[PDB]
Structure formats: structure tokens, C-alpha cells
Design a protein around this ligand. Structure first.
Ligand SMILES: Nc1ncnc2c1ncn2[C@@H]1O[C@H](COP(=O)(O)OP(=O)(O)OP(=O)(O)O)[C@@H](O)[C@H]1O
Ligand SMILES: Nc1ncnc2c1ncn2[C@@H]1O[C@H](COP(=O)(O)OP(=O)(O)OP(=O)(O)O)[C@@H](O)[C@H]1O
Ligand SMILES: Nc1ncnc2c1ncn2[C@@H]1O[C@H](COP(=O)(O)OP(=O)(O)OP(=O)(O)O)[C@@H](O)[C@H]1O
Ligand SMILES: Nc1ncnc2c1ncn2[C@@H]1O[C@H](COP(=O)(O)OP(=O)(O)OP(=O)(O)O)[C@@H](O)[C@H]1O
Ligand SMILES: Nc1ncnc2c1ncn2[C@@H]1O[C@H](COP(=O)(O)OP(=O)(O)OP(=O)(O)O)[C@@H](O)[C@H]1O
Ligand SMILES: NC(=O)CC[C@H](N)C(=O)O
Ligand SMILES: [Mg+2]
Ligand SMILES: [Mg+2]
Ligand SMILES: [Mg+2]
Ligand SMILES: [Mg+2]
Ligand SMILES: [Mg+2]
Ligand SMILES: [Mg+2]
Ligand SMILES: [Mg+2]
Ligand SMILES: [Mg+2]
Ligand SMILES: [Mg+2]
Ligand SMILES: [Mg+2]
Lengths: 372, 372, 372, 372, 372
């Protein structure tokens, strides 16, 4: 149920990692492959510790092995975008998140941060904030949820939500390690909780401003994968990991602006929600790397989920597509939550779509090519 | 499966290694055996920590047990050549790389450093630089790749290159330990990445000047073997560990001179590449410890490899024998990469051949005795 | 394969060993039993740390349980002879090597240090030096070499001598722990190496002066047994642990005097060798605890060994009974090596026999009763 | 990977089964559940061995437990249709295949034999003959193909088709037992062969005339499931059990009547095919129990398969929708093969659709509701 | 080490196989695939037991899945050639060996029986007799010889040849079962013996006359594969399964005509030997399915064999290319043995080459056309 790599003597590894490093510094470059969901990484040595992301040199990789280029001119370029402390190697080593460009310096097909960044710069003075709740399931190497009975099922749902105990919470060690690792690296992690299905969990990122939301979520996803690799388990973001009467996995998004956060900001919240009601199909396509196919298995109108093809909004309503928190409604200010995006969504796509519809008043089935 | 030695209680060993050492210092002598691929080692005690390699005493070993000498005159001599810090015993213990000489003080058959050093001193003013990318595969004690299904195969290639996750990268603990050990010892390690084959990895050494490149690669190979011994796995440099549609293993070499690195040095790069195009058969024989038989199983013109019988060169071409990086071509200066050498090549043999053809303008099938 | 005691939780033991000791000091007494090969030990508490071996009190043990005494008068006496730091309990605890005397204060049958010490004092002005190479094999609790295939054999010899790798060296953890323990205790250990047969190793002790050589070897043997006990394996000194085409185990002895070590000392080396050629049968009996029967299984004239019936000497000859190193012959000074003694020899017997023949010019088959 | 029931001592059961039955006769009733592809069985005791199916008494069962009815009129009825000798209990025990009728004596939703029997009685003068090649995959209790590596894949396809050997044929014990059982029971089984991917097999039923063909295939499916129960494995009829470069499963149907079986009947084959070319979509709907949502994963136009959206025909063309054997073309008489129906097809639906289009000259989208 | 199919309850299968067959008869069709080394099989049902092979109808198969045809004309044909009793299903079921023809009724590339049958019909009066000693090695599913220690080797050779005992003969159950099955089926099997290395055996077929030799050997190979499938082991015909000091596998051929079988026929043997002397390279090419790339690893001139590039002959000389039995020389009448062909040789190729060189006096490196 666990990988063979996880059965190696981990005490041996800790002895080697206790050696003083010296002067040289390791940097790990991370980018998104051609599937729109996978992550890749590799390491290089630097002569001295960088102080800002702009001191890091550019790099390259063979795009033919990642299904991002074919034939000749298969080389692609990595341009650093964000820098974080490395929790797996400690200071002064760093983690670098990069953008992907093809050989003629054009952005890659899966490079969505390029367009999103320019959109955020246009509405900078309004200070948009984002908060995302990421759900996932821990799986064994055999393709079944971690800790589940062999070729069987655990008891019915109800005691696993925010549960405590050996028979109610599976794999809390991964969650605790991931929480501590994110804090060390500088990722703005807000909290965690156990989900309805056993071995299902969730963590929250935010509130983050502008383009920083997409960077923080992707790095948090990488840390989860790397941490799970140490324990020998697999973390999946599939919207419906288990068929039948079991909870799905989504990525709820919280959105707010400076006007929304001020006194009597509830008026602006309702205007934004009204605009969102006119572009249901546009956002469904944007909330999924496959165009909406993955989210169809989850948004069936059951298990506290909204219908895929219907739009609804309400205060303190967890069955609608858009939910206004009861506290926000009473104080006439705050934020609102979008419950449509799936667990495997791209944060750069989700954040950009919200800004276009609500702040730029875009209309139609296609984004505007130039500004606005 | 792993070795029985790896199942011993490693916590017991750490208790003994925590004892203060005292005044005596341990030195490990390392040399190359008669096969041209294997490494041998043994330890002696010194009264005080040596400051330079010049003050290490000479030693000897029985050559009849290593297939390097006859019966009557079996003694061979070890002459220290380089010193490094010992990462397995910590300071002040040392690792010593030595040359092998026969009983009549003549160089051994596999002692290729003696001739390479003299060639290096001939062009010392031009400051040649070398960079080598060494690939390898992690193997279980049962003769099958580590982490692979028993009597089976993993999924098709494509998600393993620079992959992250329990189902995408096998044996990262060895790689992490090896990287830290090389940094502590003083080996000029440049970076690592996961390869197309699962359980296949690669590390880069350089840029190194002259004879230092050969010394640094051999010590890096020794550290990999010693580290893998702790975990109970086997590291192989075989060019084609597994037959079929699986990636091979090579040792790419990057070469540059002082003239090449300066402005408009691309003209010198073209001159060297032109010279290399005339001595294809000479370099193929030199790029393999068996005269080229091993590299025949890998260089078949498939899986981003060049043909064994044909010579080709190009800029940003990963299917040719010689590749010019696109960045180098744009800046009109830099280096070029030779993709012919196999994974089990001798670095002393490879570096010497490049200098002879490109800098000493040698012509023919035999090296020139004395001078160039 | 490994003992049941080795499967206990070793982390539990370290917690207890971390408790501060206090004022009392533990002392472990070690002696040789009636078989002439076995070692025994027990511990007592002392009120304060002793500074010299002469401060240690005498002790006693029941000789009927060690096959050394009669029925009615079973008590034997332990007289401390040498003191060392305890590597298993750390400072200020000590290890004590003792001599055995009968109830009437006469030396025991296996007590050979008593006569050897008096012989040593007779030639103290010549400063004899000794160096011994102890070979041994690591065995599992099932009676087979450690790491060997169950009911099978590994590959043919040749890659195991001074080998590195998971498939070439078995049980290096024991060797590393033993090396550090000897250094901490103060035993003059000179170096180690892997032997021809897999799971066979060797360590060197010396150069030691006079009676101190026998004390250091016996304590080194005790530390090896105690270290192997922690890992759950057995170390055997049997001359021929495995029948067939597998390497034997011996104890080569290096001998020199202050005259041999000075300039033109090679002349003195030859004279000693000629004297040794006259008493071949006398030394064969003295080199084995059983009278020569054990060494008969090893010294068969093959596997770089000399024949048990014939005496031969030569320079740089590993097939002769006496070997002169090539370096010694060139510099006309140094030492010579005796390759006859078996791996289970008593160092006190071996050192005494060399002095009697070479320095006291003794002749005949019996030692001289009083002095020389 | 195998069921716990299969680990019981089968020798004990054989002792009981050898007891003389006496005079009573056991009868097993078999019917199709509400899913349209599952089977249910029940056993009753008869006073004497029946000589024909016409004298077997009717029975009943609870439709609520079988999801063929709600909680008000859950009771259903079973009417015997065919009788066969029992291979699992031997003579004189028998197997009975029955039709399902509602409480109001109307055929159930999944009872397709009622309408099919009426249709083929109309064209009984032409004597239509049918032959279907049924494919299936053997799977363990863990949901993985039987004999496959744990969490892995076997070698690439090519040696498994009609293979022999421990590494080429998986689970030949089941197919041999099923073949012998079908012959004993009286099912018109024609032959078996191993398929392209390992653990996949195929058997052929026919040439069966009239409504008997639908009866024979359903009984053959029941015997396969019952036989696999003894060995503890699961037989599945999914069209695409394993995604990727692995062969799918289908049910090729061979059709002919007296016209094509006579001389120069090749023209009768041609006119029937050209009629089938018009109603491509209609037959696709009726060839799948789910309307075509299952066969879409198999008919992808690769691995020697025809595209689901394209109709084609040809002589000895295995990539077309309809295949005419080369022998049939050269002999100008015989039959034609339909490669469209999936493995989990209903035999009654498949035979009925072929009769309507090719013999009754029907057209449109809905079947012709009345008799004439 | 054994297949998962072999762990199924074989008692269950025996219960089903004991059911009376009835009246139908099963026939198994066997043919050689495109590799020229493997075999393929499938089963059909017959309405009655055929008295002779001439009553068996023709059949067909998909050549694309067998690697014998492309996708355009993948269909191939099977023509029965010989019939044998089925030992795995008992009477009246049959095994049939069939020839393979293309769609245009031409022999396939691997169909060497067609031309072989024509050649042997031209020397019918001489009545050539053949006897081949076929050697093979039993292997586990992990690629290691059956019964060998895991990741290890057994003792040195010498006791395993024709040995008896649990430690000397590995897998005699397969040998005994195969011997009994061959006798039941009608294969002219002459005897068996254990070979030099463990888990290696040999059986002898003959003396068969004419084309009968090729049919019997191929059927015997099929029975061996089928029998080994029941036990879960793999039979290998590789000439050198294990490199090193382990014996190889070959197929010695014994040849004689009526002239050599008459009085003073030793001279006729001698004329045949000298005719075989000047066509050594031609026969070596035809004695291997790959032209000699396999037999080169066995005929190294060691382990009592002959060199690949040298021709030799002699009486009772087992190290020569051709051996004449001492008893044959003593009686001046008999046969001669060819020790050149490898274990994986094609009997049709071997018999044809011997006939056309010794009895038809062919010369050159190419076989004669219709002229011979
Ligand atoms: N003003 C704000 N603007 C944007 N995001 C905000 C704001 N205030 C809080 N958030 C974010 O909203 C998220 C709240 O997630 P939380 O898990 O508490 O939701 P919840 O209401 O319990 O919903 P659910 O039932 O979906 O889990 C956090 O990520 C937080 O950072
Ligand atoms: N001027 C130089 N001269 C010589 N070697 C250099 C020089 N600059 C860099 N190198 C070396 O070249 C190597 C760069 O190879 P690296 O593996 O990073 O990339 P790559 O060749 O594109 O990758 P791959 O061939 O594995 O796809 C490093 O070992 C580096 O030290
Ligand atoms: N002058 C000396 N007098 C006595 N002993 C000495 C002297 N110099 C060195 N020695 C000892 O001789 C031994 C050297 O043996 P070592 O195992 O290093 O080499 P070796 O005899 O060539 O090895 P092997 O026989 O295993 O091939 C050491 O124990 C060392 O202490
Ligand atoms: N005249 C006929 N009318 C109807 N069915 C027939 C007739 N003759 C034979 N059949 C049936 O056709 C089927 C032939 O199946 P078989 O496996 O031999 O086909 P195939 O041509 O090799 O196809 P495939 O390669 O798709 O498996 C059998 O079920 C057989 O009973
Ligand atoms: N007159 C004959 N003509 C042809 N073949 C014959 C004749 N007599 C015997 N044979 C065949 O020769 C073969 C003899 O093989 P056998 O293994 O007994 O011989 P061998 O010389 O002892 O073998 P090996 O080379 O293994 O030592 C048998 O297959 C037998 O049928
Ligand atoms: N150990 C010695 O050399 C002398 C010891 C001395 N008797 C003491 O006071 O301990
Ligand atoms: Mg939440
Ligand atoms: Mg929420
Ligand atoms: Mg590289
Ligand atoms: Mg490279
Ligand atoms: Mg030594
Ligand atoms: Mg020695
Ligand atoms: Mg078929
Ligand atoms: Mg078919
Ligand atoms: Mg024989
Ligand atoms: Mg023979």
C-alpha cells in the first residue's frame, strides 16, 4: 500500500542531511507541464544565497519529454517568478517557481500566469483578495484510499468530519507535516480540517492579493506532493476519487475588493454576484483544465453541491453556486464564496475569470484580446 | 529487494560513530582495478591530519587479487593524487584518490591519468574546461530496477522525467544523500534531475579545469556506490540496463576553452567541431572501456540519441552527435556538448581525446608518443 | 540469521544509557578460559575512577564453570594486567584485562602471558616491535556466512577483495563500528580492508613494543565479539570457515628490532630468517592453540598460502612462509613478515617463540626452563 | 487476489458430493435481473426427474430485492423456457432458464425474449442461423486482471494471442473447465482461443438456429460465472476493462439464413449488408445495454477496430464494421460477420435487430410495434 | 517464482474434467508463429472423431496478431499435416500440427516444412533416419533457473549429471509427466537424462524416418510447454541461459541411411563426413534460427565442446564437431552424430541441410533450386 522507497531506512538519510552544507546553495526549479495539472522539478547549485527572485538565472529543459514540444526546437525556457524557503533542505536553500516559454520566447500553452498577471496589474488600485480551499484524498500505491479496508469500505459517513481518533482520522501525520512545512516556506496557509469522507482532508490558503494567490496555491500543491512522497502515499486532486455515496472534492474560492471590505460593502457584493449570474457557461469552462468534464462528476446537486448547469445564489446557503456568509450579511461587508471550481482547477484561470467578469465588466464567450 | 546488510539496526552504528575520535586520523585510499570500471578501497591510520596531498605516504596492494598482476611479482604501488574530506566519517578523516603503478614503477594498464596529466600541462595556458553529465539506474539486489513491480513493468514513459510524487520518482533518498555528501567532500557537483526511465537519475559535475575533471568524476562515482551501499541498493552505469522501449544511459561532455568563452568565441567552437568531424572512429573507441561495444547497445538513433556510425552536428539539436546550445549560438560564445560518450566511460580517456583532436591537431588512429 | 536479542528495540536502551551515571564507576574484567580461545567477562562497581592499573583490586571466579579447575578447589584468581577506556559505556568506565592463577597462586594452564612477559624483559634493550594482521569471517546465527544466499553460494572470487558496493562488501557496519571503538579504547589499530571471500575482513594492530602487543590484540578481539553481539552476528577466527575454493584465515606477524630498523639493518633481518629456517616444526606447534591441527586445513600451498610441511623465504613473495617487503629490501632496513600463524593463534605464544629463536638463539624442541 | 471461499478445503466438499442423491431431483432456476446484464439463481427440490421443460412448475421471487419492482407489488413470476443438464451437480439434476413476468402477467422491462421469440417465428421459414464470439477478462477480487503484476503491467502485446506457456496464457484452468461443463450441459459451444491481451479469452457459440441461440449464450454466461466462483476469480464482460494500449472486448455476431447458404448466395449477403448500411445508428443503440455509452470506449478506430461513427464493409477486412470471410467470397456462399456489438450485449436484442432490418425490410428509428 | 495460475486449486479442475464428454470431439490446432521459435494454439469442436488427418477441415487465424502479416491481408490459413492423441484431454480428442499459408496460398516465411517435404521425397529409397537430443532448462517466472538459490548459485558442477536426490535433480516431476504424455500421444520418444548443470534436462526423439522427424520434435516441444504451464514453470531453449562456468544447451542430431546401416557401412559414413567438411559455414548458418548469433555463445571450445570457427571429427571424440560412436567404429556399421546445432534449432532446417549435402552433393553458399 506504500511505495518501496518509503521502506528504506530514513535514519540513514538524516545522518547525511546533518552534514554542514558549506558555501554553495541549492535551488529547486518548479514548473507546470503540458497536462495543465502536473508539476516538474530539478535542482542546480548556486555560488551564493540569492536575496531576491531577480538574482536567479534563467534555465531550460527538454520539452519533448514533457509533451510540451515535438521534433526540433524542443528546448523550452524557465523564467523565475517567485522564491520561497526550502523546507526539505532548510536555509539557505530555496524553492523557485518559474514560467514556461517556448523557443521563440512566446508563452507556453499551459502558461496562464502571463495573461493573468497583466489583468491583475490593470485593477491594482482596487486590491482584489482571494481565498481558496483545496480538498484532496490520500491514496495508497495500490489505487485505493489510504487506510481503507482491503477490497472493502469503512462505515457510513457522519463521524469522519473533523473527527479525532484512530478510527476516525486517517493519515494526520501527512497533514501535520504539510502544515509545518508551508509555514516555514512562507506560504500563507490559513487552516486545515478533516473532510466528510475518511482519508479526505482540506487546507485553506489566503487571503492573498492579486497574482500572489496563484503562486501560493501552486507551491502549496508541490509541498503536499513532496511531503506525501516521503511517507510513500499519493495525494490526488481528482474531483470524484470514489464513485457512489461519497463526498466529492472541490476548490472553493473567496473573492473580495477594497470597496467590498469597507462599510456598507454588501452593495458591491450583490452587484458582483448579479454580473456572475450572466456568465455561468463561461466560468464553468474556465474552472476546469478539460473544459468542465472533470467537474461534471462532482457537481450533481447532491452532498452539499450545486448543479453543474444551474446558477443559484443565497446567504448562508451551502447548496447554491454562490454563498454569502451569514456574518458577512449581518455586518453588511466582507466577501462571498464561489463553490463551483473543482479540486484540480488552475488558480490562475479561476482568479482571472473572476476579475474579468466582476471588475472589467466583460461580456461574451471569449476574453478581450487587449487590455480590459 | 535490498541487501541483508541494509536490514541491520542502523541506530546501533550511530552510537559508535558518536564517540570522540581523538588524535588519530583515518585515510581511505581509492584506486581503479584492472577492469577499468571497478573501484577498490582500504583504510589506514595516520598520526596527524595531513594538510596537503603531498604529505601522504605511499602504499601498496596485492595485484593478483584485482586481476592486475602476475603471481611472482604481484605487488602494486598506490601513489596519492588528490585529497577530499570524508563525508562518511566527517572531519578530520580524508578520502585519497591514487594512481596505480607496477612493481617496476611503470604505469598500470588501466592507469590513464598518467598520460592525460601530461597532455593537460601541454595546453595549460588555454585553460580548457569540462562538464560531464553522469546518468545511472538504481537496481535492487535481485537484478531488477528499484521500485519496479516484481516480474512486471511500470506505466509507459512520459510522466517520470523530472517527476515528483510517490508514483513518479523512485529512490530520491539516495539522490538527496549523494548531493549533500558531494558538497561536503568538495566535489564540484552542479545539479541533479530525474530521467525519463523510472528509477533513473543524473547528476552534473563541472565546470572543471584540466585534470581536475577526471579526479572529481571518479570520486563522485565512489561516493554514489558507498551511499547506495548504506541503503542496500546497487547503482549501475550500464549504457542499456533494460532492453526495449526504455531510455539508455550516457555521459554527455561539455568542452570549452578560454578563446571560446570570450567575445565572438563561436568561431573557435565551429573550428573545433569541424576537427571532430574527421575522427569519428577514433573517438568512438576512446569513449568506451571495451573499445565501443558497450555504447553500441545505446546509440541506435532512437530515444534522443545519435547513430553510432554517423557524425552530425547542429545548434539546439538533441539528436546529433554534437549539440550547440541555443543560448550559446545567440551570444556567439560559450561551449558545445558531445553526446557520444557512454555512461561507463573513463573521464581521463574522454578528456584526453578531446584535447588531442581539438587543441593539439592530432591526425590518425594512434596517439602521438611524446609532445603532440 | 540474526539473534533474537538483536531484534529488541535498541532505542529503548539508548534512553537508559543517557542517564547521568553519578559518582560510581563500572569496571569489566576480561580473561581467557580453558580452551585457549574463548573470552569471559563480568562487571563490578568501584567507588572512584582509577588512574592506573595498579589501583584495581584483585578478583576471583569459579573455575569449575569455565573448565579450568578441579572440584574441591574451584576458585581461581584474576590479577589485572592492562586497563583501557570502555567504548560501550564511555568514560569514566574501564576495561580490565587480567591474568588467571590457580588457588595456590600458580599460573593457569592457559596463562601464557606470565612466561612471555619475563622473556620480553630479557631483551628489553633491543626494543622488539610486532604487528599482526587478524582475519575473521562474519557468520549468521544459522551457521552460514553473513549475507550469503540461503543454502547457496555467491559468485566466484575476484570482485570482493577491497570491494565497494551492496553486492561486493557484506557487513561493513560492523567493521566501521569496530574501528571507532578500538580508537576510543586506546587500542593501536592500524587499518582495515575487505578480504577475498565475501563477508571476510581483516584489521591490523601495531607496531607494538614487547608484551604490549599481546594485550592489544586480545582486547581488540574482545571488542569485535562485543560489537558483533549488538548487531546479532557471530565473528569466527576459524582458519578454514568454508571448505572448498574459498580463502582461508590467518594471522600474519611482522617482526623487527632496533638493529633491523637502523641503516643497513637488512643484514640483521637475514640472520634472523636463517635461524627461523632451523625450527620449522617448533614454530608450527607454537602457532596453533591445538598443536598445529587447525592450521593444517588452511596451509595447503594454495590461495596465496605456504605449505605446512615446507619452509621457504623470499623478498616480495606472498607464497613463502617468510616474506620480505620489496620496500624493505630496497631501503636495506625495516621488518619481515611471518605468514605461518593461523587466525586463532595466541599472540603471547607467537611473540615468545619469535624472540626465543631469533634473539636468544635457542635450539631444540623444548623452551629453556630458566631464562635462555 | 482470490476470494476467501476459494481457500476452503475443496476435498471436504467432494466427499459430500459423492453421497448417493437418492430419488429427489434438484432444479436451478436462472433469470435476468433489472440491470439487464446480471443473473440470479435459486434451487428447489422436485419429486421426479422431468423429461421436458414443458412440465416444470412455475415459481416466483421478490422483485424489490432485485430492483425489478417497488414495495407494493414486488412479487414477480418465473416461467421456464429452456432446460439443460446440471454440470455442477451431475445427472439427474437440471438447470432451468426462465422468463420474468410482472404481477399483472406482463413481461418485465428486461424481458426481451418475449418480443424476440414472436419476431423470429415470422421468418422461421428461412431458418436464420447465428454465431457469436463472446470475449471476457478474468479478474481477481481486487479489481485487477488475474495474473498481472501487483500495481504493474505485463510485457507489450504480441505474444499472448493464442499463446501457450506459463508466461503467455493466464488462467487456462478456468477455460478448460468451462468448455467441458458446457459440453456436458448441452450448450452448443464451438471453440475457444486466447486473446491479444493476457488474461483475456473468448469462446464461440453456434451455429444455433432460431430463438435457441439467445438461450444458449445466456446459459453459457451463467456457467462461466459459476465456474469462476469455484476458483475464486471474477469474469467480467466490460468492453474496455483496461484503458490504454490494451485490447478491448466485443461480441462478434455471425449471421446467415438458407438463402446465403445455398449456391451463389454471395449476392444475398451483399443485399443484406447494403440494407444494414442505412441503419448504422439504430443498430449501435441496440448493440449496447446502455445505448452505446459503453461501446464508445472500444470502437476508437485503433487496435484493428472500426470507428463507432463510421460504417464500412469489405472482404477479409478486420478493420471494417462488417467482414466477409475470404473463403466465403471465393466460394460465393456462406455468412457474414458483424463486429459492432460489445461484450456485454444482450443476445435477444442483437438477434432481433438483425432479423428486422435484413429480413423484414424495416426502416426508421423506432422498432415496428405491431405484428404485421 | 511460480505463476499465479499454478496456485489455483487443481482439484477443482479434475472434478470438471471427469464429466463424460458426450459425443462431440475437441481438436487443437498448432502452428509456428512469425518468430520461427514459438508456437500458437486454438481449439475447435468436431461432430465426430476423425480417423485420419486427411479428414480434418482447414481453418484460419489473424496473422497481424501473430506478427506474420500486415493489416491489409492479415488473414492466413492453416492446413493440417499430422494428428496425435490429446494427452491433456484424453481420447477421443486430438492434437493436429498445421502448415501456414499466406492469403495467396503461398507458404509463409517460417513455413519451412513445405520445401523440406519436397526434398526428402527425392531420397525416399535411401530411407534416411534422424534422431535429435533436445536439451532445455527449467526456469521460474522471475527469470532464474528453477530451484536455484535466490540471487545465488548452487555448488560447482559434477554431481548433477544424471544425478538422483533432492539436492542433485531439480524438477523431475515435469520430466516424468512429459515422458508419459509423449508416449500416450504417440511421439517417438527414446529416453531422458539429467544434464550437467542443475535444472537442465534432455530428451531424445527418434529414430524417425523422413519428414516424420520434424513433426514429432515440434509436437514434443508443444507438449513440454503445455505440461510446464500446469506446474507454473517456463521451459527455455536458449543455447546459453546462464553465462559463466555453466553448461550450455544444444540439439545433437544423429543421421544415417540404409547404406550406413548395412554391412561395412562405416565407409559410407566416412564419405558423408568429408562432404560435411567443406560446408562448415553453410551448415552453421542453417543450424541457428538467427543465423549463428545464438550458437556463438555456446560453441566456445570449452566445457567439452567444439569451437564455432573450426571443423573436427573423430571416433568417440566428444569435443569434435562430428562424433562417430566407438561401438559404430568397432562394428564398422551404424550412424554418426552432429553436435553443431543449437537447442533452439528448427528441425526442418536441420534435416533438409543434412540431406542435400550428404545425399545430393550440393555445393556453394546457397541452396539449389528445382534442379535439386
Ligand atoms: N475578506 C476576504 N477576502 C477573501 N478571502 C477571504 C477573506 N476573509 C477570509 N478569506 C478566506 O476565506 C477562506 C475561508 O475558508 P473556510 O474553510 O473558513 O470556509 P467555510 O466558510 O468554513 O466554508 P466550507 O464549508 O466551504 O469549508 C480562507 O481561505 C480565508 O483566507
Ligand atoms: N563554459 C562551460 N564549459 C564547460 N562546461 C560547462 C560550461 N558551462 C556549463 N558547463 C557544464 O555543462 C553542464 C550543463 O548540462 P546540463 O545537464 O545542466 O544541461 P543539458 O545538457 O541541457 O541537459 P541534458 O543533456 O541532460 O538534457 C554542467 O555540467 C555544467 O557544469
Ligand atoms: N617496523 C615494523 N615492525 C613491525 N611491524 C611493523 C613495522 N612496520 C609496520 N608494521 C606492521 O605491519 C603491518 C602491515 O601489514 P599490512 O596488512 O598493512 O600489509 P601486508 O602484509 O602487505 O598485507 P596482506 O598480507 O594482508 O596483503 C601492520 O600491522 C603494521 O603495524
Ligand atoms: N454458416 C454459419 N452461419 C452462422 N454462424 C456460423 C456459420 N458458420 C460458422 N458460424 C459461427 O461463426 C463463428 C466463427 O468464429 P471464429 O472465432 O472462428 O471467427 P473468426 O473469423 O476467426 O473471427 P475473429 O478473428 O473476429 O475472432 C462461430 O461461432 C461459428 O459457430
Ligand atoms: N541408427 C540410428 N540412426 C539415427 N538415429 C539413431 C540411430 N540409433 C539411435 N539413434 C538416435 O540417436 C540418439 C542417441 O542419443 P543418446 O543421448 O543416447 O547418445 P549419446 O551419444 O550418449 O549422447 P550425448 O551427446 O548427450 O552424450 C537417440 O535419439 C536415438 O534415437
Ligand atoms: N602505574 C604506575 O606506573 C605506578 C602507579 C602508582 N603505584 C600509583 O600511585 O598509582
Ligand atoms: Mg473550509
Ligand atoms: Mg468554504
Ligand atoms: Mg543534463
Ligand atoms: Mg546534456
Ligand atoms: Mg595485510
Ligand atoms: Mg600481510
Ligand atoms: Mg474468434
Ligand atoms: Mg470473429
Ligand atoms: Mg544424449
Ligand atoms: Mg549425443
Amino acid at each position: 500500500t506504500t511505495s518501496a522507497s518509503s521502506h528504506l531506512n530514513k535514519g540513514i538519510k538524516q545522518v547525511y542531511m546533518s552534514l554542514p552544507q558549506g558555501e554553495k546553495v541549492q535551488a529547486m526549479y518548479i514548473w507546470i507541464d503540458g497536462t495543465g495539472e502536473g508539476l516538474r522539478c530539478k535542482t542546480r547549485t548556486l555560488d551564493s544565497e540569492p536575496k531576491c527572485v531577480e538574482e536567479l538565472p534563467e534555465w531550460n529543459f527538454d520539452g519533448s519529454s514533457t509533451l510540451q514540444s515535438e521534433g526540433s526546437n524542443s528546448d523550452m525556457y524557465l523564467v523565475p517568478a517567485a522564491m520561497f524557503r526550502d523546507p526539505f533542505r532548510k536555509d539557505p536553500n530555496k524553492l523557485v517557481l518559474c514560467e514556461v516559454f517556448k523557443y521563440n520566447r512566446r508563452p507556453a500553452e499551459t502558461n496562464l500566469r502571463h495573461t493573468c498577471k497583466r489583468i491583475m496589474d490593470m485593477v491594482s488600485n482596487q486590491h482584489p483578495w482571494f481565498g481558496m480551499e483545496q480538498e484532496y484524498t490520500l491514496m495508497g500505491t495500490d489505487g485505493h484510499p489510504f487506510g481503507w479496508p482491503s477490497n472493502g469500505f469503512p462505515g457510513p459517513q457522519g463521524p469522519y468530519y473533523c473527527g479525532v481518533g484512530a478510527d476516525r482520522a486517517y493519515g494526520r501525520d501527512i497533514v501535520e507535516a504539510h502544515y509545518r512545512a508551508c509555514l516555514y516556506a512562507g506560504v500563507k496557509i490559513a487552516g486545515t480540517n478533516a473532510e466528510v469522507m475518511p482519508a479526505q482532508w482540506e487546507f485553506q490558503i489566503g487571503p492573498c492579493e492579486g497574482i500572489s494567490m496563484g503562486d501560493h496555491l501552486w507551491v502549496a500543491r508541490f509541498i503536499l506532493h513532496r511531503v506525501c512522497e516521503d511517507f510513500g502515499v499519493i495525494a490526488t486532486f481528482d474531483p470524484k476519487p470514489i464513485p457512489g455515496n461519497w463526498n466529492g472534492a472541490g476548490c472553493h474560492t473567496n473573492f473580495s475588493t477594497k470597496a467590498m471590505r469597507e462599510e456598507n460593502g454588501l452593495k458591491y457584493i450583490e452587484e458582483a454576484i448579479e454580473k456572475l449570474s450572466k456568465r455561468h457557461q463561461y466560468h464553468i469552462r474556465a474552472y476546469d483544465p478539460k473544459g468542465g468534464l472533470d467537474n461534471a462528476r462532482r457537481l450533481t446537486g447532491f452532498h452539499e453541491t450545486s448543479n453543474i448547469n444551474d446558477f443559484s445564489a443565497g446567504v448562508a446557503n451551502r447548496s447554491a453556486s454562490i454563498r454569502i456568509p451569514r456574518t458577512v450579511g449581518q455586518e453588511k461587508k466582507g466577501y462571498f464564496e464561489d463553490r463551483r471550481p473543482s479540486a484540480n482547477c488552475d488558480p490562475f484561470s479561476v482568479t482571472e475569470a473572476l476579475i474579468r467578469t466582476c471588475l472589467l465588466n466583460e461580456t461574451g464567450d471569449e476574453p478581450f484580446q487587449y487590455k480590459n
